Swiss-Prot record, chains A, E, G, I, J, L:
GO biological process, one term: photosynthesis
Pfam families assigned to the protein according to its UniProt record, in alphabetical order: Phycobilisome (PF00502)
Task performed by this protein: Light-harvesting photosynthetic bile pigment-protein from the phycobiliprotein complex.
Coarse class of the protein's main subcellular location: plastid
Protein name (Swiss-Prot/TrEMBL): B-phycoerythrin beta chain
Similarity comment: family membership: Belongs to the phycobiliprotein family.
Membrane topology classification: Peripheral membrane protein
Residues bearing the modification N4-methylasparagine: N72
High-level lineage: Eukaryota, Rhodophyta, Bangiophyceae, Porphyridiales, Porphyridiaceae
Disulfide bonds: none
Length: 177, 164, 164, 164, 177, 164, 177, 164, 177, 177, 164, 177
C-alpha cells in the first residue's frame, strides 16, 4: 500500500521533483524517534483485549440502548461482531501507526464502511461513542499514565506520537461519519 | 508499493494476527542501515544530469547503427527521449534506494518490462549495457562509503537481473 | 515454526521472488538484539524449579476450593501435574524467547488453546493469574537489564492476550 | 433458526426436490410430543425470578474469591449483571424448549461461546456449575411429568456439552 | 429458516415474554388438524405435473401473446423455463404449507425476484395470470372437488386450509408485483 | 438408499453435530405409522401375479398397434418381457412401501428414467397408464384400511410425477 | 446410505424375493423397542464431552507413552486431534445406533483409516485402548449404572441394546485393526 | 447460437489467443459447401404447407387412439396445434440448415426436450415417427442433388438422436 | 491431442527429418477418401441410440448373468451406467475415426480403465462381449448392409474404412483386457 | 455469440419468415469475397505490435498531456495498461472483422466500458485520439499502401472492406463516447 | 500439437458432442489449400543450407559489435551455433507449414520465448531482423505461386508477432 | 519451518534438557559472523541470472546430449523448465543459507523430487552435472575470486561459509540421487 516514505514520492513525481534534501529534515527526524514509536506500540499490543474489553464495557456503561431487547446490538453474536468490529480496526490503527501514514484504513477497512453498516442497520451514535472512548484510552495508553501498568522507558517528551494517533482517530471518526 | 515494512504488515494479514517480533527488529535495522543509506542520494541527484551523457552515449558507443529508418534512433528526437528514458531510470533507482523494498522496482519498472519494448521494437540490451557501465563505476573510499555502495550496486543489479 | 526469518522467506514465497532488502536488515537487528536477548534464559533455566512454587501456589492462594470431586484439584496428583503443566509453560516461554517469532507460542501453545481445557473442564483463569503474578515480577536494574525484560514481559503477555 | 422443520426444508433444498414422507411424520411427532412439551414453560416463567437466586448464589458458594480487582466480581454491579446474564440463560432454554431444534441454542448461545468470555476474562466453569445444580433438580412425579423433564434435562445439558 | 413454531418465539423474545399458555390455544389447535394438513398436502403432490401442465396450457389458452414469434416466452427453452419457474415455486408453496408459515419464499426464491425477471424482460401480466390460475386450481385441489380425482378422507370442514393456501398465494402474488 | 432416517443422519452430517430431537420423534411416527403400513404388502405379494394381467393388458387395450416391426411389441417375447418389466415395477413399490423413503424410487427407478427408454425407443405413456388404472383401484373399507391406501396411492403417484 | 430397513431390501432383491411376512417378526419387534432405543441414545448425548474426557484421561492413566516428549501424541495439537479422532467416531457410532445398522462407519469414516494413520504414524495399541475403554464406558452409559447420573426411564430389560452397541464397537475395533 | 464460426471464436476465447489457421479454412469449406447447401431451402419453404399433411397424418396413421379424454388428441384443436407444432419443426430444420451449426437445434429445440412433453404428457415417439417417414423420403438425382440431401438427412437425424 | 496429421510429425522430429514427399503418397490418398470417411461417419451418427440399444439387448440375449438378481449389472442405475459406458466410447471411437488416429482413447477414456472397473467389480467377459458385438455391428453399419437402412452413396470400394474401424476396436478391446 | 450468418436468422424469426432467396444475393456475395477478407486480415495480424506501437507513439507525439508527471497515463504500469487497452480491442475488431458482424464488442469488451474508465479516471479525449489514429492506420493497413510492407495479393477493388472496418471503428468510437 | 483438426475435436470435447458440419468442411478446404501448400517445402528444404548465410550474416551486418566478452558472439563457436539456431528456425516453419495449425509454433517455438534468451542474455531483435529480411524476400510469379507465398509470409510473421 | 535456532530446541526437548550455556558458544559465534553471512549472500543475489546462465550454458558445453533432437531437454519449453528447475532451487539454497539450516529443501522442493522427474523422464546425469557446476561456481561466488566482479568487504577468513554452502549442495546432490 503506502507509507510516509511513499507519499513523499507520490508528491515528488506529481511535480517530477526530487526527493532529497528538502523534506529530509522531516525524514531523519522521522527515524530519530523510531525507537520512540516502538516504545509506543508495544504498550499498544500489551492490553489489546483489555482495550476492546474497556471499550465495549464502557459502551454498556453509558449506553443501555444497544442491550435493549430487540435493539441493535443485544445478542452475543453481535457482541462477537463488535468484538471483531473493534479489534480489527485496532489492528488497523496499529498498522497506520507502524506505517506512520493514514493510507491503510479507507482503502483497507472503510471501503464503503458505514453504507454497509446502515445496510446492517448499525446506529452511528454507538459507533462514534466507541471510537471516541477508544481514542481517549489509546492516548492514555501510549503514555505511562495507566492505573499501575507502568512499563519502563527512557523518559522525555513524546507528545508528537499523541498528535499522531489522534490524527488517525479522527480520520477514522470522520470516515465512519 | 512494497517495502520491508509493507511485507510484514501483509505477513500480519496473512497470519491475520498480531504484531510480534517478526516486526520489531526489522525497523531497528533501518535505524542503523537506512541512516547508512540516505547519504548517496544527494550526489545521485547531483550527478543526475551527467550520468546520462556518459551512460547513454556509451550505449551509442555500443549501438551506433541507428541511422536507418524502421529502427529506433533514426532521428535525434528519439535520442533525446532516450535521455528522457534513462532520466527516470536513475530517478527510480533513487526511489528504490530510499524505500529499501523492491516496490518501485517491481510495480514501477518491472510491471511492464518483458513485453513492452518488445512490442515497441526496442532492445533492452542497451538498457542493461548502460547500467553495466555503472556496475563497478563507484568508489567505496572515495565516492561514498563501503557501507551502501555495494547495496546501491545490488539495487541496480537486481534491476538488471529483473531485466534479464 | 514461525520466526522473523521464516516470515520473510514465506514473504519471498508469496512474492515468489528474490531476497531483497526486505530480508537484509531484519537479521542485523538480531545482531544487536538477539545478542541482547539470550542472557535472561540461564536464570530462566535457573529459576525454573522455583517459579512454579511461587506461581502455582499463588494460584492455589487464588483458587483453593478444589477439594470437591467433579472439580480439577480433587487429589494431589492433579496438583503435581499442575506443576508439570506450568513446567512446560515457562519452558515454552524459554523457547519463544530464543526464536523471537511466535511459532512456539502459536503452533505449540495456542494451537489447542480455546477449547482444550474447556472440554477438559479446566479454567484458563488460573493459567492467566499465575502469569499475572509474573507481570511486573522482574527487576530491570537488578534481575537483568532494561533492554530485554520488557520484551520478556511482552513475550508472556502476548501469551495471555492469546489466552484471553 | 434451526428447528426440525427447518432441517427438512433445507433437506428438500439439498435434494432440491419435493416434500415426501421425510417430512410427513416429523410433524406428527410434534402432534404428540410438542403437546407434551409446552406445559413446563409456565413454571419456567414462574420460577424465572427465583432460579437465579439459587443457581448464581450457589455459584457464589462455588466461587467467592471475587473481591480482588482484576477479577470478575469485584463490585456488586458485576453481581447483578451476573443475574442479568443468567436471566437470559433460562430465557433462552425457554426458547429452545418451544422450538425443539437447537437454533436458539446454536446461533444464539453457541455462536460466540468458545472465545467470548475468554477475551472478556470470565470462566464458563460457573456457567456450567449453576446449570450443574439444575441437572437432577427436577421432580418427574411432582414438578411436572416424566415425559418432558428428561428432555428438558437433555436441552440444558446439550447446552453444557456445547459449553464444554 | 422459520416456522409457525418459530415466529411465536421471535415475538416472545421481542418482548422477553413467555411462550406458554397465551398462544397455546392456537398451538394445540394447530396440531389438532395436522392430519388435516397431511390430508391436504398429499393431494397436492398427486398431480403436480398436472398442476403445472394445467397452468401453462391455460396460459396459452387465453394468452397467445407469449407464444407470438419474437415474443417473450415462445421457445421450448423458455417453456422449460416456466416448467422450472412454475414447479419450483409449487415446491416452495408446498414448503410454506408444510411449515405452516410464510417465511420460506421471499428469503428463499424471491430474493429480488422480479427485478431479475425484468432484467430477463419477463412481463408481469403473464406472471399474475400464472399465479392466479394456479391459486384457483390449488384451492380446487386441496378439496375433493376435482373432475373425478376423488381421494378418500375423513369428511368434515377444512376451509381453514383454504384460507391458509390463499394467504401464501397473495403473499407471492404481491411480492411478484 | 434414502429413508427418513437416512436423511436425518445426513442432516447430522450436514450439521456435523449431535443427534438432537430432529431425530427423536421421526422414529416415533414410524412406531405408529409403519405399523400402520406393513399390512398391505402381503396382498401386494398376493396379487403380484394378477395385477400384471389387468394392467399390462389394459395397456394393450390402450396400445394395440404393435404388430409392425421397428416398434416395441412386434413379437410376443417383447410382451412377456413387458410382464417381466411391470413385475419389478410393483416389486419396487413393495420396496418403497417398506422403507418409507424414496430411495428405492430415486436411485432404483428414477436414476435412469428420463432417457433410458427414450434411447430404447419405448414410451413411458403406457408406463404411466397402467399405473393410472391403479390410481383409485383400491378399496379403503374393503381391500385394506383408509390409513395406508391413500399413502400407497401417494407412493405410486409420486412415481408417476417422477415419470412425468 | 443404508439401514436395517434397507439391508432387508438388499438381500431380498439379491434373491428377487419379497420383503414381507418372513422377516416381519424382526421388523415389528424392531420398532416395538424404538422408544427403548430413544431411552438409550439420549443418555449417550448427555455426557459426550464427559465420554471423550474420560476416554482421553484414562488413556493418560495407564499409558504415559503418548505423553512422552518426542512421543506420538504429546502435543495439544494432537490432543485436539484425538479430541476430534474420538468425538467424530462417537458421533458415528451414535449414527450406527440410530440407524440400527453398521453401514455408516467403514464407508464413512474408515475409508482406509489405519493406513492413513500409519502414514501419520499412529500406534495401534493406543487406538485399541481408546476404543475398548470407550466401549466399556458406553455399555455402562446406556444403562443407568453410572456414578449418580440416574436418569428416569421405564424399567425392564434392555440387554439387546448392549449387544447392539458392542457389535458396532468390535466392528470398528476390528476395522481399526 | 452455435455455428462452426462461433465455436472457433470461443476456441479463440478458450485459448484467449489470436486467430490462426484453426479459423482460416473452416470458412473456405463454407465457400464450397454452404454454396452447396442453400438450394434445398426454397422447396423446403415450398413444401412447408404439405409436408405437415403427410407426416402428421401418417402419425395419425401411427397413433389413432386419441378420442378418449385425458389423452392428447381428444379434440381437433389439439390436432391443428399438432400442425402448428410440426410447422415450426421443419422451420427450425430450415434454420439449422442455413447456419450449419447445431445452435438452433440445441438451444432452440433440445434445450427443453427431455422433460417438457413428459410433463405436458405427450410422447416424442410420434415426434420421431413423422421424421422417420422423412428419413429416406428424399431423392438425390431427382428432388435435389446428392451433395446436400444426405446432409439434410444428417441434420434432422441428429435431431432424432437428440430426441432419442 | 494427436492426429494422423500429427504422428507424421512426431516421428519426423524423432529423426529431425522432413515431413514432405516421403509419406506424402499416404497423405494425399488420405484426403482423397475424406468424403468416403464422411460417407462412413454420418451412417454412424444415424442410429447411435439403436447401436447402443442393439448392444445392450444382445448382451441380455446370450447373457442372463448380468440380469441375475444380486448380479453385477441388474439394476436400471447400472443399465444407465452401460448406457453411458457404451455411448461415450461410441463417441470416442467416432472421435478416433474422424481423427484417423488412435490417439484419443487410452489417454482419454482408458486412463486406467479396467483397474477402476475391477474396483467397481465389472466382469471382463461382459465387456469383451459388448465391444465385440458393437464391433461387428459397426462394420455392418459403415457399409450399406443393414436391414433396410439403405442410405445413398457413391458406389465403389470402401474396405479400407473397415480395416480402420476394426483396428480401433481391437485397440480398445485389448486395452480393456 | 452472433454473426452476419446469425442476424439474418434473428430478423427472420422476428417475422417468423424464411431465410432463403431474399437476402441470398448478399449471402453468396458475402462468401464470394471471403478470400478477400482473408487477404485483408492476414495483413492485420502482420504488424499488430507495430500497430499498437504506432498508436501509442503517436499519442505521445501530439499529446504530452498523458506523460505529464502526475498526469493520467504517465507510468509504465499505465503504458502496460494501454498496451492491453489497445491490443485486446485490436483483437476484438479482428474478431468483428472475421465474424463480419459488430456483435462481439459491446457485449464483450464494452460491457459498461467508459463508466469503469471514468471510475479509473481515464480522459476521453485521449481515447478518441487513440481509436481514430488506429482507425486511419488500419484502413491504411488493409490495403497495400504501407511504407514498403508490400504483400502480394490478387489485384482489384476491395473498398467494401474499408467501409466494413470503419463501421466497426465508429461503432466502438461512439460506444466509448 | 495444435492443428485446425485438433481444434475441432477439442471443440467436440468442449461440446462433449457429436461431429457435425463444424468439422465437415474444414477438411475440404485442406483438399483445396493444403494441396496448394505443400509445393514450397522442397525448395524450403532446398534453400535450407543457404538461407542461413544470407539471414544470419545480414544480422551480423546488423549486429557486428560482438567481439567483447560478456556479450553473445565473442567466439566463432557462438556464431556457428547461431547457424545451428536458425537451422531449426526455418525447419520449424517447414513444420508449421505442413500442419497448418500453430502448434509447432506455439508449444515448440513460443512456449519458452519471452524469457529464455532474456535469461540467456540474447536479444530477439536479431531473431526478428533476419526474418525481417525474409518478409518480402519471396517471388509470387517466380519463386512459387501467389497462392501460398503470402500464407508462408503469414506463417513466419505470426512468428514475429509472437516474438514481438 | 525450521532453523539453526530451532533444531537446538528440537534436540533439547528430545532430552527435555535446557537450551542455554552448553551450545551457547556456537550460538554467539553463530551471530558473530552474521554480517559475514550477509557479506556472502548479497554476492549471491548479484548475478543469479548469470549463475543460472552459466549453469545452463556449461551444460550445453560438455553435454550435447540434452540438445540432441528428440532428446530429453532440447526444447525452449524445457530450457524454460531448467530455467525454473535451476532458479527456484537457487532460491532454496539461498533460503538454506539465510536460515543457516538444511531444513528447507527436502520438505520444500524435494518432496519426492526425482521420482517425479523419472516420471518426467529426466536423466540424472544431467542433474548431477547441473548441481555440481553450480556448486563450484557458488563457492567461487561467495568469495571475491570472480573475473572482475570485485565487491568490497572487510577482509579476513570466511571458509566456514564455504563449508556451509557445500554441505547444502551435497545434501541436495544426494537427495536428487
Amino acid at each position: 500500500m503506502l507509507d510516509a516514505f511513499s507519499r513523499v514520492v507520490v508528491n515528488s513525481d506529481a511535480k517530477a521533483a526530487y526527493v532529497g534534501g528538502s523534506d529530509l529534515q522531516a525524514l531523519k527526524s522521522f527515524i530519530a524517534d523510531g525507537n520512540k514509536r516502538l516504545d509506543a506500540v508495544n504498550s499498544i499490543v500489551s492490553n489489546a483485549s483489555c482495550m476492546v474489553s474497556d471499550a465495549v464495557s464502557g459502551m454498556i456503561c453509558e449506553n443501555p440502548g444497544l442491550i435493549s431487547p430487540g435493539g441493535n446490538c443485544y445478542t452475543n453474536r453481535r457482541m462477537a461482531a463488535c468484538l471483531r468490529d473493534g479489534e480489527i480496526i485496532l489492528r488497523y490503527v496499529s498498522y497506520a501507526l507502524l506505517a506512520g501514514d493514514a493510507s491503510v484504513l479507507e482503502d483497507r477497512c472503510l471501503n464503503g464502511l458505514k453504507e454497509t453498516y446502515i445496510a446492517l442497520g448499525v446506529p452511528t451514535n454507538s459507533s462514534i461513542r466507541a471510537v471516541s472512548i477508544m481514542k481517549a484510552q489509546a492516548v492514555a495508553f501510549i503514555t505511562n499514565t495507566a492505573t499501575e501498568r507502568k512499563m519502563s522507558f527512557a523518559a522525555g517528551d513524546c507528545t508528537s506520537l499523541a498528535s499522531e494517533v489522534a490524527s488517525y482517530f479522527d480520520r477514522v471518526g470522520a470516515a465512519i461519519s | 508499493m512494497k517495502s520491508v515494512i509493507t511485507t510484514v504488515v501483509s505477513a500480519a494479514d496473512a497470519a491475520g494476527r498480531f504484531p510480534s517480533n517478526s516486526d520489531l527488529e526489522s525497523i531497528q535495522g533501518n535505524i542503523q542501515r537506512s541512516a547508512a543509506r540516505l547519504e548517496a542520494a544527494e550526489k545521485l541527484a547531483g550527478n543526475h544530469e551527467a550520468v546520462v551523457k556518459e551512460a547513454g552515449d556509451a550505449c551509442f558507443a555500443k549501438y551506433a547503427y541507428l541511422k536507418n529508418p524502421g529502427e529506433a534512433g533514426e532521428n535525434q528526437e528519439k535520442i533525446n527521449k532516450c535521455y528522457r528514458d534513462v532520466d527516470h531510470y536513475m530517478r527510480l533507482v533513487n526511489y528504490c534506494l530510499v524505500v529499501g523494498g523492491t516496490g518501485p522496482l517491481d510495480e514501477w519498472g518491472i510491471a511492464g518490462a518483458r513485453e513492452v519494448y518488445r512490442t515497441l521494437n526496442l532492445p533492452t540490451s542497451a538498457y542493461v549495457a548502460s547500467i553495466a557501465y555503472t556496475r563497478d563505476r563507484l568508489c567505496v573510499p572515495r565516492d561514498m562509503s563501503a557501507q551502501a555502495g555495494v547495496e546501491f550496486s545490488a539495487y541496480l543489479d537486481y534491476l538488471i537481473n529483473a531485466l534479464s
